[PDB]
Design an enzyme around this catalytic site. Structure first.
Site, PDB file in Angstrom:
ATOM      1  N   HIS A 147      19.540 -76.578  -2.138  1.00 11.35           N
ATOM      2  CA  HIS A 147      19.724 -77.935  -1.616  1.00 11.35           C
ATOM      3  C   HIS A 147      18.877 -78.944  -2.403  1.00 11.35           C
ATOM      4  CE1 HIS A 147      21.010 -75.632   2.143  1.00 11.35           C
ATOM      5  NE2 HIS A 147      22.001 -76.461   1.942  1.00 11.35           N
ATOM      6  N   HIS A 198       9.503 -82.104  -2.546  1.00 11.60           N
ATOM      7  CA  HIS A 198      10.865 -81.940  -3.069  1.00 11.60           C
ATOM      8  C   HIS A 198      11.396 -83.331  -3.438  1.00 11.60           C
ATOM      9  CE1 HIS A 198      11.435 -82.749   1.171  1.00 11.60           C
ATOM     10  NE2 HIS A 198      12.476 -83.473   0.708  1.00 11.60           N
ATOM     11  N   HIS A 208      15.117 -85.988  -4.047  1.00  9.53           N
ATOM     12  CA  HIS A 208      16.526 -86.327  -3.840  1.00  9.53           C
ATOM     13  C   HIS A 208      17.004 -87.208  -4.996  1.00  9.53           C
ATOM     14  CE1 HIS A 208      16.162 -84.963   0.447  1.00  9.53           C
ATOM     15  NE2 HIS A 208      14.892 -85.388   0.369  1.00  9.53           N
ATOM     16  N   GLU A 252      16.917 -91.850  -0.864  1.00 11.63           N
ATOM     17  CA  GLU A 252      17.333 -91.764   0.536  1.00 11.63           C
ATOM     18  C   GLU A 252      17.131 -93.089   1.247  1.00 11.63           C
ATOM     19  OE1 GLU A 252      15.908 -87.790   2.158  1.00 11.63           O
ATOM     20  OE2 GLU A 252      18.106 -87.693   1.905  1.00 11.63           O
ATOM     21  N   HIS A 294       9.512 -86.616  -1.839  1.00 11.40           N
ATOM     22  CA  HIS A 294       8.944 -86.448  -0.505  1.00 11.40           C
ATOM     23  C   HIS A 294       7.851 -85.375  -0.527  1.00 11.40           C
ATOM     24  CE1 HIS A 294      12.907 -87.937   1.336  1.00 11.40           C
ATOM     25  NE2 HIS A 294      12.066 -88.938   1.043  1.00 11.40           N
ATOM     26  N   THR A 306      15.517 -85.526   6.998  1.00 15.81           N
ATOM     27  CA  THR A 306      16.784 -86.055   6.443  1.00 15.81           C
ATOM     28  C   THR A 306      17.758 -84.935   6.091  1.00 15.81           C
ATOM     29  OG1 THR A 306      16.150 -86.096   4.153  1.00 15.81           O
ATOM     30  CG2 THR A 306      15.614 -88.123   5.425  1.00 15.81           C
TER      31      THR A 306
END
Ligand SMILES: COc1c(F)c(S(N)(=O)=O)c(F)c(NC2CCCCCCC2)c1S(=O)(=O)CCCO
Ligand SMILES: COc1c(F)c(S(N)(=O)=O)c(F)c(NC2CCCCCCC2)c1S(=O)(=O)CCCO
Ligand SMILES: [Zn+2]
Ligand SMILES: [Zn+2]
Lengths: 260, 260
Positions: free
Chosen positions: B64, B89, B91, B102, B115, B196
């Site tokens: 992911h 991690h 995004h 995000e 994050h 999230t």
């Protein structure tokens, strides 16, 4: 059985309305990375939009928006098929955050958005039949910003106190719906998408006009404060606010513009 | 059994994870109407962030995102409880639309977002136990813009070609995690929200720093193109792109800011 707020809100629509978690969902953010000029797009022509003042048209609070029924005598030219009108309705925010359009442009909401819903009357006998069928629907979207008082929008807003609660209905005399459209309707965004409410059928050709219209600060506040989502006998009333869907993912697909 | 794209995408998460359709969901758009200055919001202190160069920390492609495991001796001071680190991690978007933060700011996405996830170690023994409990989590968010090369982010990114597929792992030598944070960390947005990703627990205290950091074009492209959601021997690879959640409704609530 669906709302825009709380446990039955938009993240849960897909439970009972699977297409809300499916393909071609609307609305979307109209931004440069997914736009392409298409020189073959042509201007729409608005026929039978000047509704007879001697006729009347039903305004309804359906618990989700306020809708005005429109006659099939009203139609759009310029698409592959004749599309005839069925209804128009609006989406808006709230007094503290008056930015409740569905579509955004370059990440920006507008104050509100008007949708004029049509169905493919060359293929289908009525909007209900068209609604879940290939090429079934076409929606015109007008983005709304705060500015000068707009007499034409007031022809709708001046009747709202008669449909405050879900299920309530009131007739409106015919008026010229074209007065609700912006300048240079020739300039628009076009894409294949969906209904923005359950059942979310992926059957809508969207046309979003480039240029907004204006209503006054007072008209916006009136719209945001006029209506309730609940029936008159509901012990837990809910104000009709923020009745817009969040923008959807839109990957490896394109919006076509009629302006370069 | 959840993704960011198609029938298991985010509109369907609530079918699998009840909190994803619940209250307090993140991320959100940070915009003027919902901001409120709060002078009580003082600077966090980042303790034990200078990880020993003599130690190795596990980087994992979890299908992911790409995550880096962090030790519980790293912690945030300044909030009511101490929160200790568990992982960080990222995004991001995709090369055709490189706008995958995000959180958004005045409707604008940044290129990516980092994050740094912490858990309430005063109340709970570990992050898993904390994740579904009152005041369980605190996440620091850094907005990432494309511009100048970033040597500090390259301490992670330089390993991406060794964690290309789901389940693959690499070691990253300790470095000062504070180097990943932007200028003027005293300036930030703060609000109560959620994970999230599934399970979407509404247990996160979010701190979004006001100022972005920059990574280069090449760094951003590496992040967007190095990784796959699938295992090394899938004949049908699925790229790890667009691994950000759309912004959520945020009504009758405020984001507090440490700047005016
Ligand atoms: C405000 O709700 C909407 C709505 F948001 C949209 S949108 N934004 O244009 O996709 C609609 F098109 C409709 N009407 C369409 C009418 C033509 C087909 C018949 C089925 C209903 C779709 C309606 S509705 O008021 O009728 C409520 C429909 C509940 O399913
Ligand atoms: C990239 O996925 C994320 C994630 F997006 C976020 S976010 N954006 O900060 O809310 C996460 F916090 C986490 N980790 C938290 C770890 C501490 C609690 C234990 C449960 C998982 C939450 C993770 S994860 O890589 O671990 C995958 C979680 C699958 O449930
Ligand atoms: Zn609509
Ligand atoms: Zn995250």
């Amino acid at each position: 059985k669906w709302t825009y707020f709380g446990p039955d809100g938009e993240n849960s629509w897909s439970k009972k309305y699977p297409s809300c978690g499916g393909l071609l969902q609307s609305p979307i953010d109209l931004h440069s990375d997914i736009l392409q000029y298409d020189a073959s797009l042509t201007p729409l022509e608005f026929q039978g939009y000047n509704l007879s003042a001697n006729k009347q048209f039903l305004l309804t609070n359906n618990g989700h928006s306020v809708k005005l029924n429109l006659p099939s005598d009203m139609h759009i030219q310029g698409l592959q098929s004749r599309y005839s009108a069925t209804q128009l309705h609006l989406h808006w925010g709230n007094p503290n955050d008056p930015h409740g359009s569905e579509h955004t442009v370059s990440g920006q909401h507008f104050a509100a958005e008007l949708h004029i819903v049509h169905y493919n009357s060359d293929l289908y006998p009525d909007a209900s039949t068209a609604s879940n069928k290939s090429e079934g629907l076409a929606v015109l979207a007008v983005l709304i910003e705060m500015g000068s008082f707009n007499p034409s929008y007031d022809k709708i807003f001046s009747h709202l106190q008669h449909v405050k609660y879900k299920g309530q209905e009131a007739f409106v005399p015919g008026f010229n719906i074209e007065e609700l459209l912006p300048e240079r309707t020739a300039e628009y965004y076009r894409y294949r998408g969906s209904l923005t409410t359950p059942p979310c059928n992926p059957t809508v050709l969207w046309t979003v006009f480039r240029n907004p219209v204006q209503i006054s600060q007072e008209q916006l506040l009136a719209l945001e404060t006029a209506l309730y989502c609940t029936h008159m006998d509901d012990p837990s009333p809910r104000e009709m606010i923020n009745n817009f869907r969040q923008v959807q993912k839109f990957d490896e697909r394109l919006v076509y513009t009629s302006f370069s």
